[model samples]
Target: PWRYRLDQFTKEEQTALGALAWAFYQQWPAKEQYLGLDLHPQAHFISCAPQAIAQLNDQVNGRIQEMVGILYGYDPRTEVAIFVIGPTQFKLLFFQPIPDPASCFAALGLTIEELKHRLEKTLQEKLA
Candidate 1:
């Protein structure tokens, strides 16, 4: 059911998607290097284990008794883009700086081609 096919979307649609993704990302405890995004509301989606979603949500949302993990910094209207992958995972891609020469993709389990391919597919589906 989770087909990884691109879909054409208007500017408004894209904006809506991005907003959802950004809001979701803001709920998680991101690395200091990856500042300015959130991921808590959808904490029910990231981990890939039994009750992973529940654990993830409880951990990030600080719903559990321990009250661990980092909270998102308060910033207004940062404009983070969202890319949904399958049913379980989504990514928050920043567009402002356009990424410098080097980013921590390899460490983050991603490669340059992976990012490029996703963008290319989206462009083809929408612009091509």
Candidate 2:
């Protein structure tokens, strides 16, 4: 029952999410794999309060164990963006909320518009 929940996200937020997701998707296959698990195209976006961190950990661990027959030991309480690829493995993109376009673009030496354009181009290449 995973789903995208961006009803609370603004236009800028949506654009940011799209850019991040696409970038992650592109990197997923090339990244090193530990407990190798399948990577699906679909992803879910969940929001929870800081107070719910413990519960979220438990939920993620339980779901991962149920799906991939393995238990994760790390803590994700501080992560702002996480991608669960399979039941057993996930990736943390950022430890804190991304502040603005500059924060991300500065790292890649690209503007927000350029990044988005790259994301779209990558998506098309993958689809084709």
Candidate 3:
């Protein structure tokens, strides 16, 4: 279901899209770059809308409830990192992640592609 949205893109395009997603992640909050996995190799810090963080919250909540649910075990409130850029108006936000990196999706019972698919779908639904 999620992949349907990504199917519109080629592998390279998907990588670009992922990069853009990463850029938004690093650009949010208007300061502090996020140095995590490089989804997009050609990413640069940019500005984002403040409201975009809320949007990401809702998206992640709706699509990745499983991950969020599992996160409850470690802490009371989920620690989400939200970043926004005012100039270019880019945003990136997501759960901070638990200790075990491999458990990220495994905990949620989803795969990376599945997560990306759901994210792509949510983005299209919102942007459409």
Candidate 4:
């Protein structure tokens, strides 16, 4: 008699195996080191284990606890960035920065020099 357990069936079919879950997050590029407009991306997605998702939600909505992980990440190869936290290693996938950096501002037609004016205005508003 051949034996096929339910767990074995799960291995062959399940969302965990097929629909792999991922988290999408938005973050600002670093102010130091990577200082070129053309070198950094403004968004990232993290593929995590199912259990980690519970803690991840707390982090995504707000930092309810010490969410020790890189929600926003940098890509090294094949657009993959490996991250560690809470005993699980997550997969970080990249959305290129090439046009993303400029595209948003380009959508509004604002150059860096022009964009800097807004910050200057903000200071004046508060200082006054």
Best by TM-score: 3
Error of 1 at 23 (Å): 1.1
Residue-by-residue lDDT tens digits, candidate 2, 1-128: 11122223323343454345334434443222212112245333333232343354586764433322222332222222433343344433333335443344345665435654554354333333
**Candidate 1 regions off by >4 Å?**
1-7, 10-12, 31-128
Supply the TM-score for candidate 4: 0.23
* Candidate numbers sorted by TM-score from highest down: 3, 2, 1, 4
The TM-score values for the models, in the order shown, are 0.24, 0.26, 0.28, 0.23
Q: lDDT tens string, model 3, 48-113? A: 332443454486566534333332222212233323222222233434334223333334454444
What tens-digit string does per-residue lDDT give for candidate 1 at 101-121? 122222234343353344344
Q: Per-residue lDDT for 67 in model 2?
A: 24
* Error at 102, model 2, angstroms: 2.7
Query: How well is each residue in 51-88 modelled by candidate 4, as lDDT tens digits?
Result: 45446556566442222333333432212122222212
| The candidate that achieves the highest lDDT relative to the unseen native structure | 2
Q: What lDDT is obtained when candidate 2 is compared to the true structure? A: 0.36
